[PDB]
Design a protein around this nucleic acid. Structure first.
Ligand SMILES: Nc1ncnc2c1ncn2[C@@H]1O[C@H](COP(=O)(O)OP(=O)(O)OP(=O)(O)O)[C@@H](O)[C@H]1O
Ligand SMILES: [Mg+2]
Ligand SMILES: [Mg+2]
Lengths: 441, 437
RNA sequence: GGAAGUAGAUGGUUCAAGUCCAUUUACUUCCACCA
RNA sequence: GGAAGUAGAUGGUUCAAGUCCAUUUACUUCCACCA
């Protein structure tokens, strides 16, 4: 019931069992053999090399150390070559930096080429700091492995673990740095209660200061923010979570929640009670990696939200979902239907030439004078948010992300009501609307 | 059919025929006999005394001159007493300054008490500059009185004659100062096309200058703006009217625009086409003079319009109507119905104590973080502008004018649709909506 | 692919566009995919 | 009766509103009712 006993039981959730450890060790042995046989230069890095990986998430990182002189294309060719040669099976899928993902003896492996630099200043490939991260952490993280695993488990259970665009949260490496800086999970959590959007953590200097934004200085590269891709809102969520946990510590904070199946009827009743327009833009998912797709979904949904705000539909929040074959951009608005008529501002009464020009247009209704200015009634070409978005997405597809917008150009549809509640978007609708009691465990 | 021809056909509408001119003289005969009987110091002033009133708009002005020693109360009692004695029929209804309205041999009369002071500066009673107004216009208006009639008829036809709150247009006295200034109706109309909201007209100096506001300076009182009560919008409407007349002169500018009757069903159709929420607050009309009522209706309208704005009902315009029994506050809104759920801004995430208090509130839905701050979903008590206004008027009756607010306190209703279209508000709704035909 | 920045060009909307909606050229940086 | 200003005294709403919604005391003009 006290934190210490909570943390004891939480360890059972985050520490790999021996069987998984063994499986890891054997795959490592086979990998070393295959790599030694190739006469190639490599280093084991990341959480496997440092024993800071989470139970159930074993993945080995092998880095291939190439001459700095190699072209980016040579780095790609050789890296991919070696990767395919040493893995039992493999997939090649990446946004910018080339690497091979695959499996050795049932264990997942990233085989990543990088440049063998003397110093990680003026990095040549995106991943060149990673060998230096490992060397910096290796003799500083000893005996703190399980503190790292607690922080990772805590973050993961609360959906803010990982720096990738799909999460915009805390990387593993960031977790390790925090644990070195504060000494323990408990100390990190206690101090994070006092973090601000201006907090700078400089682990190499042993220092917390104030800057322009939240910045965790990489001890390997003073210019690098390790928390560069942690969103303001996810920072906010972690700070609030640390405050909640200290107030009432519970094993529940390490237990992930999953969305409940909600009947389309609970949904109908909820939307009816809210009195809002709830609708989605649906279109075929571009065949691109997550790290390209997610910022494009984010862009498309903002541009449309922004359209809905300037057209006076009073959008509340938006959300999105990428399924296997489709994407959905979700919106909720306060205004289900607006009037046809609106006001357009004309010139001041003194300005005769400009008043003429304003009055020259034929309208259904007479212009009028109000507070020394001419005004006119005009008519909208749409009166519902759905009609607005049909128009907007048809004509502004191009501004909705490179691949998302091109897909929307080819086909999109607007869905609402039970048709929507039948789409795989109920978790996102529930979160968007702040529906109580729709998640469990 | 050119400009000067239009102006001459216009005279038949503004110049009183000799029979009503005679009607006035023998009422003035009977007035001077009755007043020349109690002694009484009195002086005929106003438009009758300058010969500048409109055809069929004959009212005589008689001013009782009282020594400056007379109290506020004795000016009232003694002045009212003389007015009652001298008039065949009489009514006593006023906002501040006491007078008697009545009839003598079929002619309307005002009997007005005032202080006979030297210099109309540092004024004692509200009406003290009027006899001096007349002493200035005496000769200066001779041979120009028909140009005055032309201007008054032009303003009267366009709903902008009169300085009273019901109108907020041009006073008869102002009309005479303009004709004295510019020389003719035509010259006034020609020049007024170039008036701004900043124009200052000083007749005593004989100049048009640019000042802080529209200020037609009284020659007998340079502190006083004769156009004090002319609304910016009615100035704007006159200036435009002048531009329209000079661009294409017509006798139609001198005839009152037709009432143009619209039946409930056509009005209904138009509202449906606009897609707006159109409704009224109806209540019993306070038994008060117009000059007290109309500023309160304006205030009530504005206060409710501002409520509708901040409640996101997107009001377009408002209007009001006073009948014999009832008053109506009319509104058109872009939003017929709003959602029950809305967003309310909470504190920045760093502020632990305020977040805690923000989150302690009992709500139907879970609060959320957006761009570094907490937000709550909250639930409205009303979802339509009619129910919103019902709540507002019940709760804020006190802020809606002294008497108008008191009447709303005891009873009001919100009315829309066929029921609203049955009410005598059709003129105001058409004006509000810019309805044509 | 997304974001930030600098120096520009253009279309549309409007009585009126440095100001709103978009389109576009160059040079900068950054982030995600490994950590 | 409405409006503008000078010195304030409250209440309500809100996480917090010297900034939102209202209430009130004194002084000081102004406007409409006649012109
Ligand atoms: N041609 C135009 N059409 C529509 N709106 C305009 C136009 N020009 C200016 N505006 C408006 O003015 C904004 C541009 O800022 P700017 O510096 O011109 O102030 P401003 O418009 O002159 O404001 P104000 O008229 O109230 O002084 C725009 O956001 C827009 O709302
Ligand atoms: Mg790994
Ligand atoms: Mg008169």
């Amino acid at each position: 019931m006290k934190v210490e006993e909570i943390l004891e039981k939480a360890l059972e959730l985050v520490i790999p069992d021996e069987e998984e450890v063994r499986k890891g060790r054997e795959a490592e042995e086979e990998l070393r053999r295959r790599l030694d046989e190739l006469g190639v230069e490599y280093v084991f890095v990341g959480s496997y090399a440092r024993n800071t990986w989470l139970k159930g998430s074993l993945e080995i990182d092998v880095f291939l150390l190439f001459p700095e002189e190699f072209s980016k294309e040579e780095l790609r060719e050789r890296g991919l070559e070696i990767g395919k040669a040493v893995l039992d099976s493999y997939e090649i899928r990446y946004a910018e930096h080339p690497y091979v993902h695959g499996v050795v003896k049932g264990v997942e492996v990233d085989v990543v080429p990088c440049y063998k630099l003397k110093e990680p200043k003026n990095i040549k490939s995106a991943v060149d700091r990673t060998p230096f991260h490992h060397k910096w952490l290796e003799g500083r993280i000893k005996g703190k492995e399980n503190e790292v695993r607690l922080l990772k488990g805590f973050l993961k259970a609360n959906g803010i673990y990982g720096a990738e665009y799909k999460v915009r949260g805390f990387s593993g490496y960031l977790c390790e740095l925090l644990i070195v800086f504060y000494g323990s999970f408990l100390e990190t959590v206690k101090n994070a209660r006092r973090w601000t959007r201006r907090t700078v953590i400089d682990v190499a200097k042993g220092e917390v200061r104030k800057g322009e934004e939240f910045f965790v200085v990489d001890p390997v590269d003073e210019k690098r923010n390790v928390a560069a891709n942690l969103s303001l809102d996810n920072l906010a969520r972690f700070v609030h979570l640390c405050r909640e946990f200290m107030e009432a510590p519970s094993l529940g904070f390490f237990k992930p929640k999953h969305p409940l199946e909600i009947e389309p009827e609970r949904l109908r009743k909820i939307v009816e009670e809210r009195g809002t327009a709830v609708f989605a833009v649906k279109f075929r998912k571009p065949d691109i990696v997550d790290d390209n797709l997610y910022p494009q979904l984010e862009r498309a949904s903002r541009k449309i939200f922004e359209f809905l705000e300037r057209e006076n539909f009073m959008p509340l929040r938006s959300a999105f979902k990428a399924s296997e074959e489709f994407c959905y951009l979700l919106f909720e608005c306060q205004i289900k239907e607006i009037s046809r008529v609106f006001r357009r501002m004309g010139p001041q009464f003194e300005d005769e030439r400009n008043v003429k020009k304003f009055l020259s247009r034929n309208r259904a209704f007479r212009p009028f004078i109000e507070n020394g200015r001419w005004w006119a009634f005009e008519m909208r070409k749409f009166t519902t948010p759905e009609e607005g978005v049909r128009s907007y997405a048809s004509t502004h597809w191009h501004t909705l992300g490179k691949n998302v917008g091109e897909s929307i150009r080819e086909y999109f549809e607007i869905i609402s009501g039970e048709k929507l509640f039948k789409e795989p978007v109920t978790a996102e609708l529930c979160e968007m609307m702040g529906v109580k009691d729709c998640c469990c465990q």
